[PDB]
Symmetry: D2
Subunit: 114 residues, 4 copies
């Protein structure tokens, strides 16, 4: 199934934050309505916050996360969870190798903000 | 129901990161085995990271997040979500006022690391 | 925070299913637009499906689950999770006593159907 | 990433319930320790419960859900979510066709029971 694609409320600000846990340098690209809106990168095996940014989901609300290492796309896992019918998290894990810890880049999208 | 309390696997490193979305200064306390292990404080209405740290869950695995604003305890919401049977998120929102956006401090715990 | 309240897309069929795990007879009421639309009762300590049914979310999309044991309301927990940006689960646990297993009545709402 | 595989606490009873939403007949196999422990089958486009059972997770706790339709395995999506640190749901959706609604067999595992 497709992973890393979320329909957010239209025209709404959201946070997107990436954490690294791998010997490989991660590159995280965040697309809004199919165009790159943020790129984060770094290399840590201790959960460094390699990027965090506030973006607007735009008129369609479509947000997609893709992760690569060495130009090679990582395998993604994702889900969205909503607490008390209002607080939202869109969650992504990714695997760049063979150990299947899926934490090599971790991306959290949260809304609403403010 | 109690919120903000999670049982992690014992003796396991985990990340904890907090964001703020309120006019009030947030104070986030993280307890491991009922003892304070990290404290973050800051103010933002734009989802700024007010702290990030790596902690060890110790022999009990018990981790608790508590949020207060000028000593006033915030009401919490929380859940844990596991992707591909590997990647864990323990998520907390909190409310310091009346609007019930529950984003006034948002805390993300993630494991495994590395 | 409020629990057991979910906003579904309007005029959409959804499934609601209740399980019991308690010595007390559970009463589960499912409200759509603040009016009872399904009701299930029963006693099990083995996860009996005390009822399942297909409902329509109607014009408001507002769905609320209430649980009681001989008229005494149980304490609720809930969340919603979305898989591959399309498959929705609204989840409820409830506690009728002191042990805080929160499984005394468990309710799962799922959509879309068909 | 692998989907439909969950590690439960060892030697713990859990409920498993399957719903169908497709023209095709669904066969759902539930494996414990890599051997089939239960099989459900049925056809519905109205979310009928095609099976429900209580099983033991056994010594290893490894539980896997597989879904077959028309002679081929369906594509799965899954996650686990824990409420109030007590109540566990392991959730599976599956796609047997081309519309990507992922509801063709929906499987809910819940624990603890009793
Ligand atoms: C730490 C770690 O990181 C990572 O892993 C890795 C892999 C994948 O990426 O890879 C490997 N390799 C590399 C090479 C070059 O040649 N080879 N092999 C590595 N190793 C070394 C020794 O280097 C590793 O590290 C991830 O995935 C994991 O999870 C961890 O984090
Ligand atoms: C922005 C916002 O923030 C917050 O809210 C707030 C409240 C609660 O906290 O409070 C109020 N107030 C304060 C005071 C002092 O005295 N009074 N009242 C505020 N307002 C003002 C004008 O200041 C507000 O702001 C939260 O909760 C929300 O959500 C938002 O974020
Ligand atoms: C099995 C169980 O169930 C339940 O718990 C119960 C409680 C709450 O509900 O309660 C009690 N009690 C009752 C009475 C009348 O008289 N008293 N006390 C019971 N016990 C007996 C002996 O009966 C119990 O059982 C729930 O919550 C739990 O979780 C379990 O399931
Ligand atoms: C009636 C249809 O049957 C199969 O084609 C399913 O894959 C569709 O999702 C739909 O349920
Ligand atoms: Ca890895
Ligand atoms: Ca890793
Ligand atoms: Ca607020
Ligand atoms: Ca706020
Ligand atoms: Ca109970
Ligand atoms: Ca019980
Ligand atoms: Ca389908
Ligand atoms: Ca279908």
């Amino acid at each position: 199934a497709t992973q890393g694609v979320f329909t957010l409320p239209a025209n709404t600000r959201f946070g997107v934050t990436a954490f690294a846990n791998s010997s490989g340098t991660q590159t995280v690209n965040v697309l809004v309505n199919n165009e790159t809106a943020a790129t984060f990168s770094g290399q840590s095996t201790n959960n460094a916050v390699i990027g965090t940014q506030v973006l607007n989901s735009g008129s369609s609300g479509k947000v997609q996360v893709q992760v690569s290492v060495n130009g090679r796309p990582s395998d993604l896992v994702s889900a969205q969870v909503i607490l008390t019918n209002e607080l939202n998290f869109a969650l992504v894990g990714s695997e760049d190798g063979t150990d299947n810890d899926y934490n090599d880049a971790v991306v959290v999208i949260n809304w609403p903000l403010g």
